[PDB]
Amino acid sequence: MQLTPTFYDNSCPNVSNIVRDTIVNELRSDPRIAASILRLHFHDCFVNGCDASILLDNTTSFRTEKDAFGNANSARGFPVIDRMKAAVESACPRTVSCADLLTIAAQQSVTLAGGPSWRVPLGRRDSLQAFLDLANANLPGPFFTLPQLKDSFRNVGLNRSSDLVALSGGHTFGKNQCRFIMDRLYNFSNTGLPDPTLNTTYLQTLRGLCPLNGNLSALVDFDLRTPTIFDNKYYVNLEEQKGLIQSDQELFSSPNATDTIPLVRSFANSTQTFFNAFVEAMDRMGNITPLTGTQGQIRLNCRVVN
Numbered sequence: 001m002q003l004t005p006t007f008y009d010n011s012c013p014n015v016s017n018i019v020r021d022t023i024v025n026e027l028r029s030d031p032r033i034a035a036s037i038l039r040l041h042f043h044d045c046f047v048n049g050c051d052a053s054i055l056l057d058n059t060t061s062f063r064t065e066k067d068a069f070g071n072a073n074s075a076r077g078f079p080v081i082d083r084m085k086a087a088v089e090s091a092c093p094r095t096v097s098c099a100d101l102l103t104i105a106a107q108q109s110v111t112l113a114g115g116p117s118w119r120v121p122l123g124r125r126d127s128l129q130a131f132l133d134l135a136n137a138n139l140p141g142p143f144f145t146l147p148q149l150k151d152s153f154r155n156v157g158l159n160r161s162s163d164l165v166a167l168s169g170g171h172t173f174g175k176n177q178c179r180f181i182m183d184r185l186y187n188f189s190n191t192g193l194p195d196p197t198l199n200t201t202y203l204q205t206l207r208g209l210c211p212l213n214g215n216l217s218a219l220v221d222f223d224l225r226t227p228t229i230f231d232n233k234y235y236v237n238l239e240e241q242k243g244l245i246q247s248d249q250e251l252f253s254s255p256n257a258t259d260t261i262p263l264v265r266s267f268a269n270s271t272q273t274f275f276n277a278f279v280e281a282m283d284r285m286g287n288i289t290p291l292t293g294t295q296g297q298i299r300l301n302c303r304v305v306n
């Protein structure tokens with residue numbers, strides 16, 4: 001069954017409004033939540049598709065994806081998704097899947113942070129199991145080279161360099177732990193030197209935030225220009241060698257970036273160009289192997305199978 005933006009227009013017409021209200025409320029006390037929620041949807045979609053598999057907690061028969069290398073001590077916002085799910089369940093019982101709830105939450109998060117506004121396709125259903133090993137295999141790492149990032153996106157069904165460059169724009173907001181940039185700052189690829197693709201002035205700033213032998217869990221902003229605003233500044237940073245993690249800077253600096261460089265420039269040059277590409281890529285990501293029709297179920301509690 002094809003996903004459609006009007007899937008809940010009769011069964012739960014105010015689902016998007018309930019989701020939005022939940023996020024607006026949470027943002028007051030946790031300014032990072034819109035970033036966190038967008039990342040949860042990306043981590044959902046990259047592992048068996050956008051089927052809310054990531055929201056499932058551990059069971060004696062399958063491990064939770066929350067213990068994946070890319071999720072443990074990193075992924076967050078789970079209780080906020082529970083809160084919006086409970087509110088939607090109250091408004092429209094057994095109607096909205098957690099997979100769709102999370103997709104709407106990610107879009108509303110992006111809009112609330114100043115990004116584009118659009119209606120996501122809906123009709124996804126919820127998985128009957130979680131996929132820890134697949135999450136370890138499929139979530140890309142910040143130390144990935146550009147060919148590895150491309151392989152990771154293609155592996156899940158996003159073949160286009162625009163998919164990779166536009167979705168990496170999620171790093172226009174949110175936080176990253178020092179842990180993931182220590183090599184870049186002090187010993188990159190066993191070279192014993194910082195990553196030469198990191199702007200030297202920014203290198204100093206980052207070394208001050210993440211000293212050697214310092215708190216690896218300290219958080220740094222992905223976007224030094226507008227840390228919490230969803231905008232195209234992320235690409236302007238890359239052009240100046242100011243991408244935070246290796247995978248960010250690789251889009252502009254890798255020897256394999258002949259195809260991504262023009263996209264980075266185009267998105268730095270025009271907010272509209274970036275926003276259009278982001279919506280298009282988000283919807284392609286949101287279309288990865290959904291369960292639809294009668295497949296899977298509308299989960300009542302996102303943490304457990306019905």
Ligand code: HEM
Nearest residue numbers: 035036039042074140141142167170174175176177180247
């Ligand atoms: C291209 C490959 C990508 C890699 C290697 C990557 C890597 C990471 C890493 C290392 C973190 C920091 C985790 C932490 O410190 O706990 C992070 C955070 C984040 N990622 Fe990415 N990411 C990628 C793609 C994406 C995509 C496709 C999106 C969404 C469209 C996304 C959205 C975010 C956001 C918004 C955050 C901040 C989350 C928060 O502050 O809670 N990332 N990512």
Ligand SMILES: [Ca+2]
Nearest residue numbers: 044047049053
């Ligand atoms: Ca999933």
Ligand SMILES: [Ca+2]
Nearest residue numbers: 172223226229
């Ligand atoms: Ca920004």
Ligand code: NA
Nearest residue numbers: 157284287288
């Ligand atoms: Na597709």
